[PDB]
Amino acid sequence: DKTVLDANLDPLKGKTIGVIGYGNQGRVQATIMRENGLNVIVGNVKDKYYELAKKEGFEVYEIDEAVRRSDVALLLIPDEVMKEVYEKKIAPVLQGKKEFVLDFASGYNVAFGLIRPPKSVDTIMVAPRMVGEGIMDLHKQGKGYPVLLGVKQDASGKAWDYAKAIAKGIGAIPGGIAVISSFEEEALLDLMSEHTWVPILFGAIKACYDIAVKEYGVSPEAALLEFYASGELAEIARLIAEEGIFNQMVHHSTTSQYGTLTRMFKYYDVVRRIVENEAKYIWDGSFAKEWSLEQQAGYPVFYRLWELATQSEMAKAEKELYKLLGRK
Amino acid sequence: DKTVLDANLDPLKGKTIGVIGYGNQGRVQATIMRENGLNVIVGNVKDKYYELAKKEGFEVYEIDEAVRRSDVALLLIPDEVMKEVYEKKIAPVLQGKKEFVLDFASGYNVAFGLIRPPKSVDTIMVAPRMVGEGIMDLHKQGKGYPVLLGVKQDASGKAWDYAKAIAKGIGAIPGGIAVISSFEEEALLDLMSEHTWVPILFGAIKACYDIAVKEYGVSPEAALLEFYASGELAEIARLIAEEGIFNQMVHHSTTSQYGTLTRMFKYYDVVRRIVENEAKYIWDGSFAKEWSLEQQAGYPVFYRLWELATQSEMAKAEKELYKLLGRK
Amino acid sequence: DKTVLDANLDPLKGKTIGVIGYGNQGRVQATIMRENGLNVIVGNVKDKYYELAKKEGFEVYEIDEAVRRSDVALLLIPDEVMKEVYEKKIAPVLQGKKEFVLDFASGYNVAFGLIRPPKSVDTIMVAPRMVGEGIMDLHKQGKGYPVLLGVKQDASGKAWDYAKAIAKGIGAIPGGIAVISSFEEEALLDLMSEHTWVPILFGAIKACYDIAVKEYGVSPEAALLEFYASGELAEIARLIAEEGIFNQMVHHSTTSQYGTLTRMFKYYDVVRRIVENEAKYIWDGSFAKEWSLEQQAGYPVFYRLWELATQSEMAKAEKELYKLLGRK
Amino acid sequence: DKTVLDANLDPLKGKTIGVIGYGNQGRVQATIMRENGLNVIVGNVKDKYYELAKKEGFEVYEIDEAVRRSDVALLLIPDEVMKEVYEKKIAPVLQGKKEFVLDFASGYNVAFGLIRPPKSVDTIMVAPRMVGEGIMDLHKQGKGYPVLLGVKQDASGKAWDYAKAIAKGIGAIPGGIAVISSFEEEALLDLMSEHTWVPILFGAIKACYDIAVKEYGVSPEAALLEFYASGELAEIARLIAEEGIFNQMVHHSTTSQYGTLTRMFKYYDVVRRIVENEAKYIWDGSFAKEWSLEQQAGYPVFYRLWELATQSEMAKAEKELYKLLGRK
Ligand SMILES: NC(=O)C1=CN([C@@H]2O[C@H](COP(=O)(O)OP(=O)(O)OC[C@H]3O[C@@H](n4cnc5c(N)ncnc54)[C@H](O)[C@@H]3O)[C@@H](O)[C@H]2O)C=CC1
Ligand SMILES: NC(=O)C1=CN([C@@H]2O[C@H](COP(=O)(O)OP(=O)(O)OC[C@H]3O[C@@H](n4cnc5c(N)ncnc54)[C@H](O)[C@@H]3O)[C@@H](O)[C@H]2O)C=CC1
Ligand SMILES: NC(=O)C1=CN([C@@H]2O[C@H](COP(=O)(O)OP(=O)(O)OC[C@H]3O[C@@H](n4cnc5c(N)ncnc54)[C@H](O)[C@@H]3O)[C@@H](O)[C@H]2O)C=CC1
Ligand SMILES: O=C(O)C1(C(=O)O)CC1
Ligand SMILES: O=C(O)C1(C(=O)O)CC1
Ligand SMILES: O=C(O)C1(C(=O)O)CC1
Ligand SMILES: O=C(O)C1(C(=O)O)CC1
Ligand SMILES: [Mg+2]
Ligand SMILES: [Mg+2]
Ligand SMILES: [Mg+2]
Ligand SMILES: [Mg+2]
Ligand SMILES: [Mg+2]
Ligand SMILES: [Mg+2]
Ligand SMILES: [Mg+2]
Ligand SMILES: [Mg+2]
């Protein structure tokens, strides 16, 4: 009832498009927009990404120059830095424009009140559900992916059509779909995913390895092969996406079904408590504070935790093994 | 140091192979063994799988007949029923043989002392790391998968070569590898996987859905798209298998990296406790008892939990959605 | 809205009826069905109940013979044994029939997946709300009782009429009523009753006796007379059924009303917790496992608990007293 | 095995040395380097320390000028501010140099990823084990002190010799020794000292004073004399450094030995727990965040805690007393 499976592309036509930030997402999205008959110019600071963009047949102007030239702008730089960059390079140029469309790939900065623009511009959002490195793949298979879109500020009365045209232009639909929502919901959901069932999974795997090796005298090779060094999880996830999370298990053994179901219904309350805590922590705005301050300090915790993860026993063993298998 | 990347196939040659149980694994393995120039006959009870095997150009004899004819037998029926079936249909025919090789796809029945054969036969094990429905795929891509192999009883002094020839014959190597271990370790690892980080993941996802819908007024469609209805997890898992569990995250956003790492190191002790409890429960032999009794009663808990899972709100919503997307 | 107060009886007419199990319920139901112009034959194993049935003018055939002869069958044997008896004596004869109606007095075996029949038969349920020894009584007063009915499998499109005709035939309606429901609900409710407020009541009575005697120097006779050896509870329960559980108390003293209400609202949370625990334990299917295994072991706990109950002080005292009063 | 007791000094010769920050450490180290035939110029902002350096026969250039002139630079300013100062005054001048040696007196900024230089420079560390005011003393006694040294980045293949020459040049060896380590270990150790057994000691002393005065009616003078106003602790610490922490106690009374040992082995677990917590807090990088943010806010907690410490009863009493004794 709140979905789209295809839409138009023409309101983009004639206009000029500016993709600020040629990284994980800017690279892919700009490439596809080019392939869809949309002349896109890139705006980036002077670094290696500048070299790259300039090297892939892109007119890499400076940010403000791009905004000047462009009627549509895509703010594809980290969720952590498009505030310093906003009022210092965009908001001024914005006081000059009157017809301008501004897009995000997330609701972080705006849902938490870090970027509040004026009544002159159209303020939208369109967010994929991939990592970018997994979008090149689907595009090379004539496929599409899902997205979420939402609008905060309707200056021209035409927001939704612009959003849907963008969706079609970057390669989401046709082939996938898109749903309408707020910014709050998008932010909440992305962060719940990033905070609840990803880290829990990783910690459980790590704990299984540690235990099996240090209390049951197992060989690292076998542990790694069983837990994640094999492509089992990938096939399971594909079957989940194709058939259903539960129906999928009809391809497992009954032993697996039974153990999984029992232990799932056995541990539900604990993870429920955890999810409650984290979703509350987010809904308030505490995490955004935590994170912006982590920047302003210089990313110390970031650094140390990367180090601790890559200097763990499991990671060294994985190094040796992946070496053995020729995997890079 | 404990690995193989290719081996021979000839000791299989001349002999006859019997695949008892033409299901998830028997189907695939028998098919591939056929394709590798190994004449395989199938042994199964009279049901739909009998129809299937007989229909795919297989000489579907009765079990005992297959054992008679066969010099090698593969016991690919559920981990729950190859005891009634063992002494009643195999052990007698076995008292007649003297040169016979017997294979398992797991160490459950033998590690826990439910099947102890006599000194006359070779008792091995060879176990994949896939669900079967995900092996047809890799075989249709000229690829291989990992396995684990181990031997309990060496009657002919030639166990390991037989095991490795089987590995090569069913399609594991070349393309993947195989490692040697006990039966205890294999069982422990498979069950730890099936009991710790799969059900935890599923329960966390379910809890996220429930919370987001019942305490923050979210639309089911968006929740499902974010959490699992999208193919994000599949791409993440592929990148994990390819590059590494941590290095993979270099393709994410820094926000995701930070939240994930923090919450991973924050909740490690809890999941560690859980894994300890479950691994202990297994190492003792309690779960095998639990499970065999669940059979002998008639699978009541099994039934009820399937019902509860498929009659939850999330599953109905997924039904509607997958319908909308054309997914079956 | 989901009720019936009378219905037809003719679809039963012409057909033959088989009552498998001539015990607490089979005796009574078969007797009444006879009295309602329904020729019923009995099917039972060779024991004292066989003698009884054969002695009360019943054609006591063997089970399979009864099923052959019969177009309708009633499975009135314990909830614990109609699985061994099902596939070994019924399911085979069933593969031969195509028009056959099968009835239960409970949803235990089918709700938990211990008996799943084929698409050929009509699978219903009709369950009273009495103990059998209390139905002879009401029938000897031209009265009726309540029941619950539900159907799992509609093979002929006529289930409900068959169920209602059976209800009318055994003596429920007219005089009482009947309601439609699932099997799950019936099972849940019967077991909640049998697990929550019956045993709690008995334990409270026993504790009152023990305390009054061992800490306040009371005579056993008086304790027994007050608590249950008197017919007070019977009259209270009759008034409850007639007027209402609360309105009834208008015939008590105000002292009783006050104490009862206060202590009821005072202890509600505790019993609520207990009921939650037990209903959960049931909804999962754990109790069915517990119980089937108790059989397969040989009913040890059953035996020991009967012994402990009949060898308690209260029971001996009740023996002496009931002897004094001439009560058997 | 990882120690040095003397080394060379010549690689310093010919080069020019720049000491950025003429404070607690820069003053002392620069003075000694002068005395060792090493021409050192000072780089500092315009304040009283500028006056001082310029007044002690130092060419006090501006920071960038010093870096230009200098082939070796010592970054002896607070651990809290050499980031603003780094990229704004050093990193630019650094892009011009190719042969440059850069030294720290600690591993804080670099171990936590607040300062990551380019592959062009040599990045070392050399850290004393004194407070500076206690180094002038030992140098005026022809003695030396210990240090720790470590290198993060070897651009010229000559790091260690440079580090050891610096050690010899500032007055550590000969007379003391030096050990090699990472940056992580140095940081961890310094901070563990500053967080565990210093503050615990001070709090215990304060508590003893408070208790003795407010619950046993003692005179402040006596409490202060016993606990710290006497030079007992100094002599104890000297004997510890000379003989050993335990052997030292052979000069105490047996009463003291007994009480000390008993209560030491009695309270070990508690302090162990505390040390665990704090070392973990550090290893993650949380404290560095805490501290950099304390700066960015304006040092409020710092200020308030100084006030609370100097406005406590004990401090006023110490004021009066030290006045009485002529101590300043
Ligand atoms: N795969 C992913 O990482 C996903 C990202 N998104 C969203 O899209 C946005 C892009 O995220 P990523 O590209 O992955 O992060 P990223 O780390 O790859 O960002 C790199 C880009 O940001 C630019 N940049 C970096 N620092 C800058 C600075 N101080 N000033 C100006 N420009 C700077 C650089 O030019 C570079 O091109 C995020 O905001 C996120 O909300 C949504 C879907 C998934
Ligand atoms: N994808 C999977 O399920 C995996 C299975 N394995 C191992 O391989 C074995 C096969 O597991 P699955 O094929 O998935 O289970 P399954 O449920 O698919 O087993 C079905 C097969 O078992 C036969 N069978 C069933 N009941 C029987 C009975 N009472 N008497 C005689 N035969 C009966 C049937 O002929 C049928 O062909 C398991 O023991 C497991 O340890 C190892 C890797 C993954
Ligand atoms: N540095 C210290 O130990 C301090 C000691 N005090 C007080 O002064 C007193 C002396 O303490 P310390 O000399 O350090 O102990 P200590 O262990 O050095 O005592 C040794 C002396 O005690 C004599 N002695 C030992 N056992 C004896 C015995 N059974 N019978 C007769 N004489 C015996 C010996 O002749 C020897 O000279 C203590 O009571 C203490 O309260 C006060 C300030 C500090
Ligand atoms: O490989 C495994 O872990 C599975 C099993 O049932 O043993 C398929 C799920
Ligand atoms: O950083 C994000 O937002 C990701 C998401 O889509 O959840 C890629 C990981
Ligand atoms: O006999 C009793 O227990 C009653 C009383 O009020 O005393 C009638 C209820
Ligand atoms: O002065 C004290 O505290 C000492 C004693 O034993 O009394 C020397 C240690
Ligand atoms: Mg995100
Ligand atoms: Mg996401
Ligand atoms: Mg398994
Ligand atoms: Mg497995
Ligand atoms: Mg009952
Ligand atoms: Mg009942
Ligand atoms: Mg120090
Ligand atoms: Mg003393």
TrEMBL record, chains A, B, C, D:
Residues 1-181 form the KARI N-terminal Rossmann domain. It comes from the Archaea. Mg(2+) 1 binds at D190, E194. It is an enzyme of class 1 (oxidoreductase). Pfam families: KARI_C, KARI_N. GO terms for biological process: isoleucine biosynthetic process; L-valine biosynthetic process. GO terms for molecular function: isomerase activity; ketol-acid reductoisomerase activity; metal ion binding. Belongs to the ketol-acid reductoisomerase family. This is Ketol-acid reductoisomerase. It comes from Saccharolobus solfataricus.
